[PDB]
Design an enzyme around this catalytic site. Structure first.
Site: not given
Ligand SMILES: Cc1cc2nc3c(=O)[nH]c(=O)nc-3n(C[C@H](O)[C@H](O)[C@H](O)COP(=O)(O)OP(=O)(O)OC[C@H]3O[C@@H](n4cnc5c(N)ncnc54)[C@H](O)[C@@H]3O)c2cc1C
Ligand SMILES: Cc1cc2nc3c(=O)[nH]c(=O)nc-3n(C[C@H](O)[C@H](O)[C@H](O)COP(=O)(O)OP(=O)(O)OC[C@H]3O[C@@H](n4cnc5c(N)ncnc54)[C@H](O)[C@@H]3O)c2cc1C
Ligand SMILES: Nc1ncnc2c1ncn2[C@@H]1O[C@H](COP(=O)(O)OP(=O)(O)O)[C@@H](O)[C@H]1OP(=O)(O)O
Lengths: 575, 578
Positions: A147, A560
């Site tokens: 991995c 969102h």
């Molecule tokens: C900079 C910024 C970043 C944000 N980032 C996030 C975020 O990442 N995630 C998130 O979940 N929220 C975020 N928010 C908050 C999110 O935008 C608000 O919670 C959401 O838009 C509120 O939805 P609403 O329907 O209540 O209001 P609004 O989307 O404000 O809808 C009100 C609408 O009605 C219109 N209106 C007002 N009065 C009248 C009227 N009398 N007659 C007709 N139309 C009217 C307004 O002009 C507007 O078009 C962010 C807000 C800002 C300002």
């Molecule tokens: C290319 C690749 C990508 C993978 N990607 C992911 C992934 O993204 N996510 C994930 O969760 N899993 C992934 N896996 C699986 C993960 O690597 C295995 O599930 C995990 O490594 C198993 O670990 P283990 O302890 O069972 O064995 P291993 O990690 O193989 O440990 C066994 C060890 O024992 C040693 N050994 C063997 N025989 C003897 C012995 N007789 N005496 C002493 N030492 C011995 C070996 O040399 C080895 O070092 C991936 C596997 C591969 C091959």
């Protein structure tokens, strides 16, 4: 007594007998352990608690025998151990409370948790080189060749697409095609891997866990023989063993495969830009690698046997294919029949492999060749457990090399345990290994009833466009319940970050929620194709631990603007 | 017994005039005879005693006998007789042009409009945008679309892509060497072109769905009559059986000389014909810090003047962490409030002006006046309800001290056929998704008779500062204040996003998450807080945990996705002790 009293008693007491009501062979047990000057503590389990206890240790009749906080089963199991001589060796003192074979995700996690519970622990880790001769430090597959290097190279490929976004948002980037320099990326990745290897090496030393960079084999009921890089062989004894040996890349029985094709073991430390690449396989490893190799500007081809991402939702799989096709990855329905090396790599430049295929037309079959710089063999991962001596300690294995568990306890040997990829039926993910390790250690040395939860595990496939999922596919849900009882709610969306760009991704982002109609649209699974699929899927995965319904997703208020809020607002039903 | 809740509310939706009574019934022959005055049939329902309290709680009244008119809950007899005596009831019972008139074409208005018309109701939507003091105006979609979250997130993404260009170099992308400048005109045109597509989208969507749009400012001139004035000054009359007020808010300006003449607002920032140059952000709200953040990220010299504390309402631990980070990224914070703004240069032809900003500063001798010259001053000290000219007195809709409308839920507390949602509804959190949900859900109560309520608690947010801050539930302080320090566990960690691991980014030392847990109820989760890239994408799913009274153990048995920042919530063990 109740469960926790029994398990606590079992952890603390050297030999414990857990009974419901007075059974003849309890005397037989007393007499057998009397043979070894051992004292047999006893517990009357209440009838309210029998079933729970029986389910947790995974045995089916009541009278239960524990040895040094390990559940053996009933009398037959004990007498077997005694008759085999194992019990006589088990009851002796050993160097270590626990020996861990493997220094990976699971190994290290177990090691840290055991020692936090004040136990003497040895950790053994050795990395037998790939066929190309590649080797690496402590930390396992994830850290060195899994991995962590893959996500870094994925991020490299995304930063490619970000450079072009930056232009559309008004960043005046000096004009000129921009190339990614493989050597810089590879050094940057290898430098991080090197820091994690040191990190783990330190962490073990700081916590008083004995590390041995030595490959371990069972030469006795409670004896590993371990061989280091110099060929020096030592003997390690312990009261318990954890096998966390993981898997290695699979190679097919095809001429030239092992000579010509690299694996993920080799890709992340290549001394060359791999150039025009063929990825053989349809696993997540093939597509993840094909993906980033395309994103850093290589000509990439994927040869699949039949379907991508067998095991995954095939709707989502076909969607990944259409997208990676639009991004210029070539897919082909072939399996090579021979790999022929034309040029060996240098220390700075790649080689050339000729890849042989049978191609059909309406008149017959042609043998056909194609020359690639590098061929990534990525068809799967197998347990390399043949040379472990599991026969010696009588640990049953499945047809693959994987160890067969009664949960994490060897189904056949009560003081050997397995976790992570080598545990038969364990999902092959890093966080599963870690949780299995941490939780096992808490059962063994604390006597808690805590179980790793192997169902409804979230994943993310880090394809060019990330695929996140948890729970059933649409197919599985339909197969298990009927078509008539499944609701699929789904929608397309454009991530705001892509709104002012001309990205191909604007036509590909999709999410779907699979619901059981006759149980209030209970959520069986969810699937999303998006930037940051992993960051989005993780939290939503907790919904399945609480039998969440569609109504629960609908009463959750969105943040969102995010891709994630889309799961808050789905109304469209697929057919 | 008699009928349960959904039968009562369904009966109320379907029937023209319904009386809901308990086993016990009062005079309410007088009322029957009152509606008999109007050629009405007064249908009746024996509510079961099993259902009374639920029903009473849903409509937000305190006594049993309930009267419904054209699917609106009026209360008891006093309320009815008041409506009759005022002449309102007589006008209410007549036919009107529209089933519902919506004042506002923003997040809530448009959401409500779409949901009403999906339930087959004749709906008019009124939206008009009075220009800013600088003269800025915009199309349909409201604050979010034109001058809020949509343009802000795009300019944030611009700022992030700045830091990504540098990451690209450390991952091996050969970018030709030499300073890279962001061109304000390109970004602004890119944003304004997207806003233009949404403006069009919404206008079309309304036409396609058979909703009457009037680009006209609406005022109540009758119990059931809006007079509406368009850009040309033409006045029309619109009547309806029901009204939804979704007017939103507008930026606040202080009573300080030159403020209104010299200082822009978020209403103006997103369409500025000039790079705003050396900028002063006055205010400590999320708006000030989000804007200061991206203006820094596209390479402007940025100063924030705060009266007292950042992000009042938010966890002050997280607030201090955002401050330390934005300080490390070059934003200057000062504990000052201007006492005068003096314009030196007008903005002319693609260039900014110069404002001289006057402050009182103390030295070793006393207090002196001090000046400082900025190109642009962004007044960002909050947002007020502009409801004075709406004629809410005419239709007797009570307002709070601010201009916000006082609800019994979303129903005007004082007029039973007028409703409010979004920012103008007193005590509604000011977020786009809340407006939308309130709208969608209200419409389903009014035209379907469902008992469904918008859930206004445990709402997740993200502050899109240079390093994003995501949260849901109590702050550490609120939890401690309510339950007591002995009963709170705070689990926390630092982490480095893998995406930053091979870089020299400042963010490597600032990413943090914490989980606030009630110790005496099995570490029940009261809140969580994370400071990270993609905080919004991470917080969203985790927010659903609080709908199920999730414990720490629920987070610990959840299996992480590796590698993600999100999985950190899966493996917290360290307890904060201050
Ligand atoms: C900079 C910024 C970043 C944000 N980032 C996030 C975020 O990442 N995630 C998130 O979940 N929220 C975020 N928010 C908050 C999110 O935008 C608000 O919670 C959401 O838009 C509120 O939805 P609403 O329907 O209540 O209001 P609004 O989307 O404000 O809808 C009100 C609408 O009605 C219109 N209106 C007002 N009065 C009248 C009227 N009398 N007659 C007709 N139309 C009217 C307004 O002009 C507007 O078009 C962010 C807000 C800002 C300002
Ligand atoms: C290319 C690749 C990508 C993978 N990607 C992911 C992934 O993204 N996510 C994930 O969760 N899993 C992934 N896996 C699986 C993960 O690597 C295995 O599930 C995990 O490594 C198993 O670990 P283990 O302890 O069972 O064995 P291993 O990690 O193989 O440990 C066994 C060890 O024992 C040693 N050994 C063997 N025989 C003897 C012995 N007789 N005496 C002493 N030492 C011995 C070996 O040399 C080895 O070092 C991936 C596997 C591969 C091959
Ligand atoms: N006249 C003024 N001059 C300077 N700053 C002001 C201001 N009016 C409001 N602010 C600040 O601008 C921000 C937004 O005001 P607000 O009234 O919407 O905030 P709140 O969320 O506290 O209700 C706050 O940081 C506020 O600081 P105080 O908490 O000290 O009031």
């Amino acid at each position: 007594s109740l469960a926790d009293a029994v398990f606590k008693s079992a952890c603390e007491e050297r030999i414990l007998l857990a009974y419901a009501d007075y059974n003849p062979d309890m005397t037989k047990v007393v007499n057998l352990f009397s043979k070894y000057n051992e004292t047999v503590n006893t517990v009357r389990v209440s009838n309210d608690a029998v079933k729970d206890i029986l389910e947790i240790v995974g045995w089916p009749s009541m009278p239960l025998i524990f040895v040094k906080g390990n559940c053996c089963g009933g009398f037959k199991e004990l007498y077997q151990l005694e008759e085999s001589g194992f019990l006589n060796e088990w009851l002796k003192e050993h160097e270590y409370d626990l020996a861990i074979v493997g220094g990976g995700s699971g190994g290290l996690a177990a090691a840290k948790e055991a020692v936090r519970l004040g136990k003497k622990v040895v950790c053994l880790d050795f990395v037998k080189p790939s066929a190309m001769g590649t080797t690496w430090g402590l930390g396992g597959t994830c850290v060195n060749v899994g991995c962590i290097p893959k996500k870094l190279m994925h991020q490299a490929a995304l930063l490619g697409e970000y450079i072009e976004d930056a232009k559309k948002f008004g960043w005046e980037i000096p004009e000129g095609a921009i190339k990614l320099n493989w050597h810089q990326l590879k050094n940057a990745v290898q430098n991080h891997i090197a820091s994690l290897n040191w990190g783990y090496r330190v962490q073990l030393k700081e916590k008083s866990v004995t590390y041995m960079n030595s490959y371990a084999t069972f030469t006795g009921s409670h004896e590993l023989s371990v061989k280091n890089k110099k060929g020096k062989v030592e003997k390690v004894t312990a009261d318990r063993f954890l096998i966390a040996v993981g898997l290695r890349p699979r190679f097919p029985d095809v001429p030239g495969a092992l000579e010509c094709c690299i694996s993920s073991d080799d890709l992340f430390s290549l001394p060359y830009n791999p150039g025009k690449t063929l990825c053989v396989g349809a696993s997540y490893v093939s597509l993840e690698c094909a993906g980033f190799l395309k994103g850093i500007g290589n000509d990439v081809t994927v040869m699949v046997r039949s379907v991508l991402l067998r095991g995954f939702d095939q709707d989502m799989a076909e969607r990944i294919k259409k997208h990676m096709t639009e991004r210029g990855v070539k897919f082909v329905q072939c399996v090579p029949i021979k790999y022929e090396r034309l040029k060996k790599p240098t220390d700075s430049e790649p080689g050339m492999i000729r890849v042989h295929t049978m191609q059909e037309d309406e008149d017959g079959t042609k043998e056909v060749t194609e020359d690639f710089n590098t061929v990534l063999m990525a068809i799967g991962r197998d347990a390399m457990t043949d040379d472990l001596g599991l026969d010696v300690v009588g640990v049953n294995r499945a047809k693959s090399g994987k160890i067969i568990g009664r949960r994490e306890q060897s189904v056949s040997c009560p003081y050997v345990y397995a976790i992570g990829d080598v545990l038969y039926g364990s999902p092959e993910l890093t966080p599963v290994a870690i949780q299995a390790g941490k939780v096992l250690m808490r059962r063994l040395f604390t006597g808690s009833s805590e179980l790793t939860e192997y169902d409804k595990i979230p994943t993310t496939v880090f394809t060019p466009l990330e695929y996140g999922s948890c729970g059933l596919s649409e197919y599985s849900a339909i197969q298990k319940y009927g078509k008539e009882n499944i609701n699929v709610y789904h929608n397309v969306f454009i991530p705001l970050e892509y709104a002012v760009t001309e990205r191909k991704e604007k036509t590909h982002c999709y999410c779907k929620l699979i619901c059981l109609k006759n149980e209030q649209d209970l959520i069986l699974g969810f699937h999303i194709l998006t930037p940051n699929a992993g960051e989005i899927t993780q939290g939503f995965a907790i919904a399945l631990k609480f039998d969440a319904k569609k109504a629960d997703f609908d009463r959750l208020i969105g943040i969102h603007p995010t891709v994630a809020e889309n799961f808050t607002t789905l109304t469209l039903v697929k057919e």
